Short mmCIF file of C-alpha atoms in Angstrom, two decimals:
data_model
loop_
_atom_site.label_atom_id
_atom_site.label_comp_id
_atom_site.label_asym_id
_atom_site.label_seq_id
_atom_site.Cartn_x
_atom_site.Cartn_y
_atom_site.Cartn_z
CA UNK D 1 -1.25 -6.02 18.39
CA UNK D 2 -4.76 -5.25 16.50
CA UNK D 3 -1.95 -6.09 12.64
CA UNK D 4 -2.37 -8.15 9.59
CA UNK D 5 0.10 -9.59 7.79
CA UNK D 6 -0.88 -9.42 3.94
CA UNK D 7 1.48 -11.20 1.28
CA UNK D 8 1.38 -9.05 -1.74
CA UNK D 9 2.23 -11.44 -4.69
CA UNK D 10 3.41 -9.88 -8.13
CA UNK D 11 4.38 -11.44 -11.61
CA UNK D 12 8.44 -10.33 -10.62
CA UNK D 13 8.37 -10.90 -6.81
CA UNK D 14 6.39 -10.36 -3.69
CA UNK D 15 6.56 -9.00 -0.39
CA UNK D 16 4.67 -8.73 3.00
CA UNK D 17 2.32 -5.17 4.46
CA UNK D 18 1.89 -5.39 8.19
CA UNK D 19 -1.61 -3.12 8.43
CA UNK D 20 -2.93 -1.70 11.45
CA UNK D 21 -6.75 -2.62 11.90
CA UNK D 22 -7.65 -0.19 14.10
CA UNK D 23 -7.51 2.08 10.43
CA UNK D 24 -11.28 1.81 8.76
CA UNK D 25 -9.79 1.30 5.55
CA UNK D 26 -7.75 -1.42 6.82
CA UNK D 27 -11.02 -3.41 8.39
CA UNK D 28 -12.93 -2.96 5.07
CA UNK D 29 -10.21 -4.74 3.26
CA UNK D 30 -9.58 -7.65 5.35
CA UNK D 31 -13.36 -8.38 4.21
CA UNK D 32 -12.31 -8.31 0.47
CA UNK D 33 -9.12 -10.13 0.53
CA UNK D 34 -8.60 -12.11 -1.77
CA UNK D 35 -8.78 -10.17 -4.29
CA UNK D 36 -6.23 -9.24 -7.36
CA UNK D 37 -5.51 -6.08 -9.03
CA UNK D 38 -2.82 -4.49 -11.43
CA UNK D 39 0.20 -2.59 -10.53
CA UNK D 40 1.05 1.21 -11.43
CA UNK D 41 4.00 2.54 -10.53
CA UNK D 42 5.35 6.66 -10.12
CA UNK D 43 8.72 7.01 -9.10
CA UNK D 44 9.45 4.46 -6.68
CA UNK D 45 5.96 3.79 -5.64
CA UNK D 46 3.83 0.88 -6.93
CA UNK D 47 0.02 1.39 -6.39
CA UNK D 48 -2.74 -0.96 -7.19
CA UNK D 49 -6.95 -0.06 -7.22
CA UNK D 50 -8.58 -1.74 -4.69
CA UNK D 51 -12.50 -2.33 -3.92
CA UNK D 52 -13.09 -0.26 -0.80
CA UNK D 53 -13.76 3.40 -0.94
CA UNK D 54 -13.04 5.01 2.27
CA UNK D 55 -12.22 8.82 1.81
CA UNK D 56 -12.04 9.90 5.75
CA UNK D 57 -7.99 9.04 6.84
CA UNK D 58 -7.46 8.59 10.46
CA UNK D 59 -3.87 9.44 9.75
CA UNK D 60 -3.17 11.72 6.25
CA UNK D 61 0.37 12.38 5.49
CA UNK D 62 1.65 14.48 2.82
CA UNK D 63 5.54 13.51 3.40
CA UNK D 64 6.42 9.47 3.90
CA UNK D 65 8.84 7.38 4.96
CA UNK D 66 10.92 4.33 3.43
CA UNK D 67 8.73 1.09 3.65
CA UNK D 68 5.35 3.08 4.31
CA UNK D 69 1.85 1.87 3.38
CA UNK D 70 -0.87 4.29 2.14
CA UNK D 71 -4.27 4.23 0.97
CA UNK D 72 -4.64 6.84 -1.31
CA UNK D 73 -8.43 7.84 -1.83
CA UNK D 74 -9.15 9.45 -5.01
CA UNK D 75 -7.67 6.22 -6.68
CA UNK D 76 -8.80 3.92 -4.03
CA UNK D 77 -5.20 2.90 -4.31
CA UNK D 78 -3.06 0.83 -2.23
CA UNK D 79 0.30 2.72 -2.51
CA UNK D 80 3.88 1.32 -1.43
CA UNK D 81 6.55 3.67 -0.78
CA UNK D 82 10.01 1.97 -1.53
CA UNK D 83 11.85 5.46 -2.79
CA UNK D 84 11.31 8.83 -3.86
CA UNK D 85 8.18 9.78 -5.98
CA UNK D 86 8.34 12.12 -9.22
CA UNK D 87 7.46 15.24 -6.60
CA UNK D 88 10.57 15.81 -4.48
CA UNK D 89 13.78 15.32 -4.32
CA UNK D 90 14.75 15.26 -0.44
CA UNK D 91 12.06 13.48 1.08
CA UNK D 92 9.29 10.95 -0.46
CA UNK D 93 6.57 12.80 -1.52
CA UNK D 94 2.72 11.57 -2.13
CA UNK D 95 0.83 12.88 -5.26
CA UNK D 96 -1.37 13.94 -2.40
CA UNK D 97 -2.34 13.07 1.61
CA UNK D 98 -2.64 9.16 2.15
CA UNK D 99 -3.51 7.24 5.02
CA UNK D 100 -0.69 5.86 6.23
CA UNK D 101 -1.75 2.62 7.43
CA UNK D 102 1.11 0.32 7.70
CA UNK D 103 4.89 -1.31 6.54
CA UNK D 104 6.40 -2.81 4.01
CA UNK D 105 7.76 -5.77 6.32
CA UNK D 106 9.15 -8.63 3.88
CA UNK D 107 10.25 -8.01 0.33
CA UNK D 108 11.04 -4.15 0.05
CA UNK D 109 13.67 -4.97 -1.88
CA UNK D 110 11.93 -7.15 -4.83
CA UNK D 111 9.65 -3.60 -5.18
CA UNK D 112 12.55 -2.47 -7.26
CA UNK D 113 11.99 -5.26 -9.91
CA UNK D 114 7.82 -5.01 -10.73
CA UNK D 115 6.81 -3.08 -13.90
CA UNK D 116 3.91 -1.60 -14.47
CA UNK D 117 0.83 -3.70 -15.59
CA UNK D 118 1.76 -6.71 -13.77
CA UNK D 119 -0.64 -8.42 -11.63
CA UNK D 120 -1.16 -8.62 -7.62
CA UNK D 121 -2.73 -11.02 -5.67
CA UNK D 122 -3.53 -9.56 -2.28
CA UNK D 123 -3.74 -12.34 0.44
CA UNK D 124 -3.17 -13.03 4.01
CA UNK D 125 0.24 -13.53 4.96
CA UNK D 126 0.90 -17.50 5.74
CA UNK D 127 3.46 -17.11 8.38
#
């Protein structure tokens, strides 16, 4: 294991990301957490800005799966894939390529429940 565990709290719930370090992305934001941010969401997707710009993705993906992590670059956007997005309607479908770079572990399904504009606080998981 070269994962970290990072509690995503939210005004209407919370949940857990297990990240894979070995991802650039991933090391540059274990150096900024904690930090908060506000939630957007687009279908069943909820992304947040966060303060690391890293446009090069080890590992792009232009389909998804249920409970996958992204990092989207042109919004420097944590993304978290719970259901189908506004672009398809047979598989889960980013606006464009993200890095996938981990899972939704704890908590997929209070993703359901946050609205958009409520605030995150990204931290390290306790447990």
């Amino acid at each position: 294991h070269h994962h970290m565990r990072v509690e995503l709290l939210f005004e209407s719930g919370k949940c857990v990301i297990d990240l894979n370090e070995e991802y650039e992305v991933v090391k540059l934001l274990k150096e900024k957490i904690p930090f908060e941010s506000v939630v957007n969401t687009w279908g069943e997707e909820i992304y947040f800005s966060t303060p690391v710009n890293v446009q090069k993705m080890e590992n792009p993906r232009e389909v998804v799966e249920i409970g996958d992590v992204g990092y989207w670059p042109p919004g420097k956007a944590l993304c978290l894939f719970f259901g189908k997005t506004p672009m398809s309607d047979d598989k889960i479908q980013p606006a464009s390529a993200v890095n996938v770079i981990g899972k939704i572990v704890e908590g997929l399904e209070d993703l359901k429940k946050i609205k958009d504009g409520e605030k995150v606080a990204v931290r390290f998981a306790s447990s």
